[PDB]
Write a protein that binds this ligand. Structure first.
Ligand SMILES: COC(=O)N[C@H](C(=O)N[C@@H](Cc1ccccc1)C[C@H](O)[C@H](Cc1ccc(-c2cccnc2)cc1)NC(=O)[C@@H](NC(=O)OC)C(C)(C)C)C(C)(C)C
Lengths: 99, 99
């Protein structure tokens, strides 16, 4: 589909059974979701955005379905006021900017 | 053009007769640029990132060349670690997310 930008580019995502809302974010290197458990191994990481850094949990080789599109990769979990789909997974569903 | 996301979407912008590099950010409501001079009046505004809020200066109806496309709207200026083009201007230049 083609998503215009008059509104926030929010879509539905499925991860580990649960359905969630998430922002398709081209200004994000990383994918970061609201605090939750994910199966298996994780590492502490620090990420930086506007107005500071937050401490998160890095989970590798995680599957998320985004608008009925398979995408596997690193998923960060932490105190984010919004679920953020970053480039690492956007590339995986063939997401591009056009104008 | 069609910009892929295997790398930070960094385009050439022109503002106040200065060439800068800026990030095409779908996950940003606003356009935030690093400290610089701009003509006209400004208001104060708070904006929130991942880490917290920052104090920025709101300038209205500022001309800005984004990847060879004219936009005239609200530009925020303040302590941001990256030049961000947000949805207010991305819509102006007819930019869309596609996949
Ligand atoms: C390497 O740095 C990153 O890629 N950092 C990303 C990051 O923070 N990416 C930044 C760009 C960057 C890069 C390097 C260094 C500083 C910045 C812009 C993102 O795309 C964010 C998303 C967001 C949206 C919304 C909110 C939020 C906050 C409060 C309430 N509700 C929602 C909070 C975060 N928009 C923002 O930070 C924009 N925020 C926004 O639109 O809020 C409405 C802003 C401030 C640029 C206009 C991150 C998401 C992986 C952490």
């Amino acid at each position: 589909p083609q998503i215009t930008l008059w509104q926030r580019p929010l879509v539905t995502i499925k991860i580990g059974g649960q359905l969630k809302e998430a922002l398709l974010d081209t200004g994000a290197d990383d994918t970061v979701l609201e605090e939750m458990n994910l199966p298996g191994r994780w590492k502490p990481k620090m990420i930086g955005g506007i107005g500071g850094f937050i401490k998160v949990r890095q989970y590798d080789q995680i599957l998320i379905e985004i608008c009925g599109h398979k995408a596997i990769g690193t998923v960060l979990v932490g105190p984010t006021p919004v679920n953020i789909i970053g480039r690492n997974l956007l590339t995986q569903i063939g997401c591009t900017l056009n104008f």
